[PDB]
Every structure is written in C-alpha cells, then in structure tokens.
C-alpha cells in the first residue's frame, strides 16, 4: 500500500502521435512537441511512452532505409534527441520502437529504447515475437525488464503482446506494470487490443499501458490506435480514441496491493 | 481444417442447472431431466456439460456432509447416476464437480468427473487451486486433459481458470477446447468472467466453455451464471444468462485451424 513493487504513486502519460511521416526531422520534432504538451498539462508526469516505429514509415521496405540508428554508448541522430527529452524533464522515456542497425551483423531490428531521468539509456528492448514481416526484421531474444528508482516495469512490442510468457516473466520479476508500444489495425484491433491489455493486467495482476499511433488513413497501415492503461484488476483507467492525442494515468502501488491481497498470486508451483 | 486437434465437428450443450439443493437425489433427478431436454432439443450432441457442485449445497459446511460420494472401481451413487446418463445418450459427460471423500486420507475435494459414451469414468479432475474455502478442502495436483475419439480437451474448476497455466498445459498437449464447470458470484462475474473465457481462448487458440450454475438468489451463494462458449479467436459463440438453461454450440476444426493459420502458435521458447 507504499513501495514495494511501486515506490510511490508515478503519474505517466501515453502519446498516441500521428508520426511516421518520410520525414524523420519532422517526426522526433513532433514527439518532441507533444511531449512538451504532456509535461505542461500534468507537470508531475514521471514516465512518458511513445508510440511503435514512430519516426519512420510503419512499411517493411523502409525500415532499412530509416533503421539510420544504431544504439551504443556514443549516440545517435534519435538516440540523442530523446536522450535530451529524457533528462530535459524528470520523466522516463520509453522511446517506443525505431527501426534498428546493428553495425556488426548488419541485421535490422525494431527496438523500444528506454531512457531515464538523467537522459542514460538504461536499456533497449529487440521484438522478440515477429511474410515480409519477418523477411526484412531479425527477432530479439532478451525479455526486458527495466530497473528504475521507482520499481521495475517490463517493455515488448507489437505481436509480443500475444505471447503470456513475457508478461508472467517482467511481472513475477518485480515489474509493477507491462509497458507495449505497438501498432495494430483497424481489423486486428477491434478483436484483440482491449482484450490481450486487460488479460496480461489481471493474469499478472500488474498495470499494463498499450501506446498506438494515431490512426492514419492516409497510410498503406491504418493504426487501432485506443492507446489504454488497465490497472490490475481489468479495469481501463485510460484510453484514446483513434485521433492523435494524449492520456494519462496513475498508477497507485495502494491499487496492485489491493487487488493482490484480494486474489493472491500463489500459485500451485507443482505444474 | 478437418480432424488434427478434432476430428469432426461436434455439437455441446452447457447446462447451466438450478440444482444444488438440499436433496441429492431431487438435483441428479434434475440433472437427468435437463439433460433429456438437451438431447432431445439437439440429438446430435457429443459433449454435454453441467455446472459446479450441482448435486448438494454451495457451502463449505455442507461438502462434508454432501461429499457422500467416492470415486473407484465399484460406483458411487452420484457416479452411478451420471455414468447411466452417459451411455443412455451417445454423450462425453463432464459431471461438472461434487463434493468427494477419499476413503484412505479422509481428505474431501471438489472433483468433476468426466465419462465416456459407453458410461465409463474416464478420468477426473480435483480442484487445484482454492478462509474456509481452503479450510474444508484439500488442493488436487494433476493437470487433467481427458483423451475422447475427436480429440483432446482440458478441464478445471473455477479458481483455475485464474492460473494460465492450467490451460496453456492442456492446450500445448493438443485440446481442442479448455472447460472449466465454475460458479462465480455477482460481484467477481462482471469483473473477471468474460475476459478470463476469452482470454484462455485466444491465448491458447482453443475453445473454452464455462458451465455455471443459475443464480438462485435464495442461497447464500449467487451465482453469476452466463455458462458461456467462445472460439479460437475470442468470440462468443454461446451464452446464458442469469436463469436456469441449455445452451449449445457446435466446435468446427476449421474455425481452430483457420485462427491458428492466421495467428501462429510458433513462439520463441527461448524464454
């Protein structure tokens, strides 16, 4: 009911951004902008999400072209600018997914970039679960589960959502909530998202925070969009529309205790 | 797309009773006499199913004196019963719980027994996971996955079918379907019912059926009822409501099969 999965009650905010125009500049200039909007209307914010690939184009045959980042100890044209975000405010930035290059194996992957509150890349998150789909992209093979001074949180992607295991892992580890920036459609969504978010909250009885784009019908991929926070017991406590725009939640460590002690989470181990 | 996790298509009926009254033999009575409706509404029937503890009272202070019944070679008056009904009609018979007695531990559970067309016990499943409510009954440790001519299928029982475990178990063995005979309340029905349905459904891309009793709101217990039946994908096929009723679906291998097509099963187990 006070830190112990959740230090204390952190205030977050969802920015379901209309990005992923050709223009890349344009693209981290708009996130930037909004998250401007979003320290502005609630200052207290302590963790900020953006949305999966959001400054490139959502299209397999582009991410090579935009993969333009790689993530090391010296930055990167986007590993810098949301690195200066990060620190710029207190918050803790999960980058939400850009297209990636890695130097050595020359394979491109979609990774979520996690910064904290000094702008530090604390850790990055490969999609692990992922025809072109997977004949242009290399899948992950670490489950990522972030430290912060607040608790842990766990961080997948897109299809990764589909898949318990990495929820039940992040989650039975500490993590006080399972954090996806992902992208579905306008027929995936209607039949999954607010499903798939509410199970792996009160399966794991953890918060759980889905970041869409903005729904572009002006694009060969037409995001869900309905980027929703759930709290442990199934409840959404926030949610977007389609549009681009900004929610915000708080998550309370009272609420996850709540809910644990009403259901415990001891389970029969002998299976 | 025809016959691999089942065989053909077969049609179930989920009887969500009004029984558990203080007289034993006036709720087999009416199991029976339900049953009869199922089979003559819908003769083709395969699999039929009844709801938690239909044969006594939902009370932790009555299973000692209701568990009457104990499960062997040499029937009991409740396997007896059930076991009758199973070959009368062609029926895979899910007895859906009752309060049992082990001779030997003097343990009592709350285990559902499932017969064959030919009226034999084929296998059974004690309650896993379970102040009372664990201080009356011993836990079961075996994950049950009944073998049938069409294919296999799963069973739990209320509580478990909060552990994904249970179901990801059977599921992965080859079941086409996770059922689970359970009796929520009007307070955690509307909460957790449809999403847990749902959720071990398209998790596990199998069919899940939940057999609860009707909402008799002169007992002590009310039960939520809404025995439902939803597909690999997670829609709703079949539903109750409050009241006492038959509901009926028919499992297709090809709804199973063209789900699994589009959303593959193939996870990285490296994790």
């Not at 909004?34 to 959001?54: G, N, S, Y």
């Not at 999609?127 to 899948?139: A, D, I, N, Q, Y």
Request: proline share 6%; glycine share 6%.
């Amino acid at each position: 009911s006070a830190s112990k999965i959740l230090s204390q009650k952190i205030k977050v905010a969802l920015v379901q951004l209309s990005g992923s125009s050709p223009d890349k500049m344009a693209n981290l200039q708009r996130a930037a902008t909004f998250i401007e909007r979003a320290m502005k209307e609630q200052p207290d914010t302590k963790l900020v999400v953006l949305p999966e690939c959001f400054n490139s184009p959502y299209s397999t045959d582009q991410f090579r072209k935009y993969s333009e980042v790689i993530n090391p100890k010296e930055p990167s044209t986007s590993v810098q600018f949301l690195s200066n975000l990060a620190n710029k405010f207190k918050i803790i930035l999960v980058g939400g997914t850009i297209p990636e290059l890695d130097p050595k194996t020359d394979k491109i992957y979609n990774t979520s970039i996690i910064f904290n509150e000094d702008g530090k890349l604390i850790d990055k998150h490969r999609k692990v679960h992922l025809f072109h789909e997977s004949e242009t992209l290399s899948p992950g093979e670490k489950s990522t589960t972030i430290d912060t001074k607040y608790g842990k949180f766990g961080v997948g992607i897109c299809y990764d959502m589909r898949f318990p295991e990495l929820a039940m892992l992040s989650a039975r580890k500490g993590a006080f909530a399972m954090i996806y920036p992902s992208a579905f459609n306008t027929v995936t969504g209607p039949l999954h998202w607010h499903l798939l978010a509410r199970s792996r909250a009160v399966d794991n009885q953890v918060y759980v925070m889905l970041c869409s784009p903005a729904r572009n019908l002006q694009s060969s991929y037409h995001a869900y969009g309905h980027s929703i926070v759930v709290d442990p017991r199934g409840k959404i406590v926030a949610e977007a529309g389609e549009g681009e725009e900004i929610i915000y939640a708080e998550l309370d460590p009272e609420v996850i205790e709540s809910f644990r002690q009403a259901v415990p989470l001891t389970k029969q181990r002998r299976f």
